[model samples]
Target: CKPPGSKCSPSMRDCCTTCISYTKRCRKYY
Candidate 1:
């Protein structure tokens, strides 16, 4: 995870995190 208050870009992080989370959830129930 990014450090608190850091000025790091979040677009890629958010996209990757969302994709990974969704993929994991799908695999769990599918």
Candidate 2:
């Protein structure tokens, strides 16, 4: 699994939260 703020691609997405929209970064829901 990927950590927060890590880079992610649309082809293969991974993150703690929902891999951000267009930003391709991960973060917490709240």
Candidate 3:
């Protein structure tokens, strides 16, 4: 998994944080 702010894709959920679909990147998970 990736940390916050890392780039992510819709097809995958590899983001350790919250994946912003519009931004296509990981954000800080609440």
Candidate 4:
């Protein structure tokens, strides 16, 4: 997996964090 704080937009950052936290690939949906 990529490192944390990997450069998401402000609007997508929160969702990205949560998605990755649950073992979902960031690129899966975002």
Q: Which should have the higher TM-score, number 3 or number 4?
A: 3
Q: What is the C-alpha lDDT profile of model 2 across 1-30, one tens digit per residue?
A: 578788876456677666776888876667
Best by lDDT: 3
Q: What residue runs in model 3 are displaced by over 4 Å at the alpha carbon?
A: none
Task: Give Cα-based local distance difference scores for all models.
Answer: 0.30, 0.71, 0.83, 0.41
Residues 1-30 of candidate 4 have per-residue lDDT tens digits of 333545334434444343344343343443
Which 10 consecutive positions of candidate 3 have the poorest summed lDDT?
A: 10-19
lDDT tens digits, residue span 1-30, model 1? 433333334334423223233233211112
Residue 28 of candidate 3: its Cα lDDT? Answer: 84
Compared with the true structure, model 2 gives a TM-score of 0.53
Which ranges of candidate 2 are over 4 A from the true structure? 11-13
Candidate maximizing TM-score: 3
**Candidate 4 residue pairs in clash (backbone atoms < 3 Å):** none
Clashes of each: 0, 0, 0, 0
TM-score of 4: 0.23
**Model 4 score (lDDT):** 0.41
Q: What are the per-residue Cα lDDT tens digits for candidate 3 across 1-30?
A: 888889998568679977788888887888
